[PDB]
């Protein structure tokens, strides 16, 4: 008659892993729901103890896998601090939607070799909060009267560790856009604040 807590701990690189697949699935679902891509062509998986929208665009599949591992890297070096997905029009390309994710890492993870008290339960349910939240957010995002495309902006403070194919670019603000913040979530190593900017409606 006994049991036992056996807490595993957390790592720099484990945080990077989990938050990477976080953004993976979150981006999947965002670009699924608002209509950005062919919804019909997608499907569902089980992750985070819940159900998730997953694509089949081999193009975007490999692309975002590259992005995922590269972010895993830059987290493992705390390199990036912003992650944004800017959605715009097709031809005139005017920005309609801009999901900003502002990133906190752990420099002390250099010396923070010993783990930190926080459970897969806790992190998992908090990302579930995030996911369900973003999902809900569709209930008020002013619908896209057209079809759209999107571009991927980040901000790593270092202009230093830049791999080959990535190029420097511009800020890409919006003139008349409201910004609304979502719940926060962290790892005690990485936190990510989240807030969507979206073009203020022309007419009420």
């Amino acid at each position: 008659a006994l049991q036992l807590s056996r807490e595993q701990g957390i790592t720099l690189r484990g945080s990077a892993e989990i938050v990477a697949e976080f953004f993976s699935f979150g981006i999947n679902s965002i670009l699924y729901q608002r209509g950005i891509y062919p919804s019909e062509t997608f499907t569902r998986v089980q992750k985070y103890g819940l159900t998730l929208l997953v694509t089949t665009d081999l193009e975007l599949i490999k692309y975002l896998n590259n992005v995922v591992e590269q972010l895993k890297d830059w987290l493992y070096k705390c390199s990036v601090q912003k992650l944004v997905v800017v959605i715009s029009n097709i031809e005139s390309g005017e920005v309609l939607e801009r999901w900003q994710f502002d990133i906190e890492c752990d420099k002390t993870a250099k010396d923070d070799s010993a783990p930190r008290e926080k459970s897969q339960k806790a992190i998992q349910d908090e990302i579930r909060s995030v996911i369900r939240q973003i999902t809900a957010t569709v209930t008020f995002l002013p619908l896209l009267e057209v079809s759209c495309s999107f571009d991927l902006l980040i901000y790593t403070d270092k202009d230093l560790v830049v791999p080959e194919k990535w190029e420097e670019s511009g800020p890409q603000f919006i003139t008349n856009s409201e910004e609304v913040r979502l719940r926060s979530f962290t790892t005690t190593i990485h936190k990510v604040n989240s807030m969507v900017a979206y073009k203020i409606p022309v007419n009420d």
Binding site: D57, E59, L60, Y63, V67, S149, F150, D151, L152, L153, I154, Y155, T156, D157, D159, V162, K165, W166, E167, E168, S169, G170, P171
Partner: peptide, 9 residues
């Protein structure tokens, strides 16, 4: 910083 790749059509 602000870094981009090719978004497929």
């Amino acid at each position: 910083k602000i870094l981009r790749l090719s978004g497929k059509p």
